[PDB]
Each structure stands twice: as structure tokens, then as C-alpha cells.
Fold 40S ribosomal protein S2, putative.
Amino acid sequence: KEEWVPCTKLGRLVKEQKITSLEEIFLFSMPIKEHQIVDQLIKESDMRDELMLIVPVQKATSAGQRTRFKAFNIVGDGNGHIGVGARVGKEVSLAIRASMIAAKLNVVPIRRGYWGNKIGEPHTIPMKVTGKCGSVSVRLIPAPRGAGIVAAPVPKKILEFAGVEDVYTSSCGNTRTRGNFIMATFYALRKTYGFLTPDLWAETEVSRDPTDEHSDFLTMGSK
RNA sequence: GAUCUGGUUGAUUCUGCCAGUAGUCAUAUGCUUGUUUCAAGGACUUAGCCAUGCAUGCCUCAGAAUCACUGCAUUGCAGGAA
């Protein structure tokens, strides 16, 4: 690795021990634009990467074609973090790198609940949801203990990395376009904190953004 | 186990069929085979045609005994065929 010097207010606060988790970030809903902030606050040997898809892309020109590779990369942790990203390069290893980097800036937390009696730790989404990308759409359905992941290959990875165990699924549209299939399943998971349930409502006391709190630091850093 | 993949373009997103995939006391047809338990089997086309043999008879203490029938006894007794 070649070293990090932060260009963001956020990044400074992460690079010293003030912000010690990604849930502080997630709360006040600040954007992450330096991949090193996800590296810093998530322990190593607990991230699981992999490449869902690598694929050629062309364009037409005079004399012949022009070729550019492309790639999809998915990343996350079984405590409820996941992201996805896809990018392009004119060589192979390029697109690989650029995907991984992208993916670590679309990290989003995932909420889990129960199907029935509340015992143990949550193994399943609390509700039905949907996502749509392109024509192809995806629906995720709660299921009881031991039901397991009943899904196609493509979705099953998304779910497994999230920390969702038992589930069921179904889809419509052309599911054979893989890039859209991925992104659909991703948009699905997101919306479990996008929906409001009697578990919550209470009008919680709200808190100041880390920037306000730690403002002392960031002033000195300017000088 | 409330699931999918390949094929229309120079490349992309759809619609839509074709092809792949798993069962079936559901039948046929090739290749192949060491032990044991269990079990369907001329229904599909022709409810078309049939050689030969067998497939429904029955007697007890208790309906009719002169077998010219059998045993024992010697003029009676017990079996008793068709």
C-alpha cells in the first residue's frame, strides 16, 4: 500500500481515533469518497471480496473496433455491511482494481429481524422488499429458521456476504443480464432501513455531527 | 429448497420463442452385472381366431341297499359301487 493523506473533513477524523465505526457515518448520512475510511474502520480478515462478472465491451470506429474490459466487484461483512461497484478499463487488471475501489464507497448497512418468535440473533430480513434495475426485478421474502437461501447463483452471493441467512426470492424480467440482476438484489437489501415499523417509532433524541463535536481538531489542521 | 442458464447486434437494454435441467409402479430399446429382501407382468393394435388337458360338486349316529360286490360270522353284522 501507498500512503493516505486525507483531503476531506471526514477522512481526518477517521485517520485518528474519533470515528471508530461506520455507524456514526451512516447515521448523519455523510458521503464516503475515500476508500481508506472503510479499510480503517473494518478489521482485516473479515472482509470478503469477489468478482461476480468480468465482460468485454466494444465500440465501433474506422478501421476496426476498440475493446475495453469491465468488471463487477462486491465486498462486505457478515455483521451487515455490503456494497457493489463496477467500472471500466482498457486493460484487465485496471478494471479489477477500479471495481474494488468503487465497491468500498457504496457500503450501506443492512437490517435483519425475525420471522416468528424472537430468540437468538436475527437470521432473516424483517419484511418483504423489492428492487428494480433495468427491466429485471427481484423480491426478497422472509422465511423461518433452516429454510436457507433459495435463490439463483447471482443473488445468493449478495445475500451470503450481507449476513442474511434464511430467505426466499423470486424475480421477473430478463434475469440473464447479470449486471442489472446484481444491482437489483443490492437495491432490495437497502430498503430495510427505508421502512418504518412499530419496533422503532419513539422520536429519538438527535445528536451533533462528528464535525461539530471534534471541530477543535479540524481548525488546527487548516493551519 | 416461494431459485435458473445458452442462442437475434459491431457493442447495449427489452419483448418473445427455441434449446438445456429434475421426477414419472410409464412404456419400449441398446449396453452392462457378484449377493439378499420385496413386487407388476398380452390393458394399449385385434371384445380378432383357437388344437389338447383341466376349471363344481356334496353322506352323517340321523332319506332310499338282495351289486349276481367285499370282509367277519356261517340265515346275521359292518363296509358298500352308481
Summary: The two ends of chain A are 28 Å apart (CA to CA). Residues 56-61, 64-65, 134-135, 139, 141, 143, 147-156, 168-171, 173-177, 180 of chain A lie near RNA strand B (CB under 10 Å from a C1'). Chain A has two domains: 1-109, 110-203. The longest strand of chain A covers residues 48-60.
